[PDB]
Design a protein around this ligand. Sequence first.
Ligand SMILES: N[C@@H](CCC(=O)O)C(=O)O
Ligand SMILES: [Cl-]
Lengths: 120, 120, 118
Amino acid sequence: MITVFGLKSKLAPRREKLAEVIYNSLHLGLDIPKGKHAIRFLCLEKEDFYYPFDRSDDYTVIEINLMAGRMEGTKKRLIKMLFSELEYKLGIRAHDVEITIKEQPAHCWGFRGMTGDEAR
Amino acid sequence: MITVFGLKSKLAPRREKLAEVIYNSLHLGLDIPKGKHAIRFLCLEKEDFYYPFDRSDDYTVIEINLMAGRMEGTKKRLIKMLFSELEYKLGIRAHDVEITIKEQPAHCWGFRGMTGDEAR
Amino acid sequence: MITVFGLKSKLAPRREKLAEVIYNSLHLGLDIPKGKHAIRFLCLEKEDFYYPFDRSDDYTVIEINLMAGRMEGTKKRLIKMLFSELEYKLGIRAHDVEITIKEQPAHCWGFRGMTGDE
Ligand SMILES: N[C@@H](CCC(=O)O)C(=O)O
Ligand SMILES: [Cl-]
């Protein structure tokens, strides 16, 4: 599952589009078909979000979990794509975007009654 | 800490039983005593949960964090048991569950004042 | 992003002192200037927080995400400094504190339009 964190005031009305944008970059960048992944939104109240001092209220954190296996370039590509999509499609400046890809071996994944190393 | 993510209407009512099942499979499958582990539940509002298109409102994500060291087979067993247990006790179709085990080096953990590598 | 999880009744009044302490340990332990990292708080309802049964409702979990690279002893320092700070400055006993440092390769990070390895 992918999670997007942000101040509720700014993130709340941006949900549908951020989902479309991520589903787009996952497809276009990793060939994962749209809707294949779960996407969650966490809308923060002001007092819970201490974003970095030099950033703005649009500060958006994206956590992406993948089964380990891809090349660094492919991972870098999705990060660059995500920045572009956010800038040109939501007005969120790369400045205010933070992203992290977390990977775990296939055998640490479980979906559809199977472990990931056994999915075929 | 282990986190369970699910849609509020479906997850809230099952909170108590899921903790038992998780404590049960942690105990039963890894030897961790009913309650040595923190378990958190995050109840999502519908607008915040884009589970995979073709799944149901019963979609439940489980994130499990452990100190590294167990063998691959041990971790698969845990995932496998969690699938069975949630099927039989909660009636959650395995197709509706996603699980990921995240592991971190012992020295990256902290509990009861020590670093994980120092413990006992 | 670093996240701090705790019972809302105990965590909410602690947020500011808690951010200061994390910024302080990150600066002294890792040389990271205050305010460079985002800190998030997740205030829990009693119903959602099954902390271990022999623990107390002060139970606090801290997840720290770092770009891989630092030395093992540095990571350990940071953890030990955080136990100090929280107990002696917030009164939260080290037994009621769980911490985990999660590291990802620089190429897995993205900020200010760049990837961490760039
Ligand atoms: N969303 C899962 C795959 C789920 C499925 O195969 O049904 C992943 O991160 O790989
Ligand atoms: Cl969360």
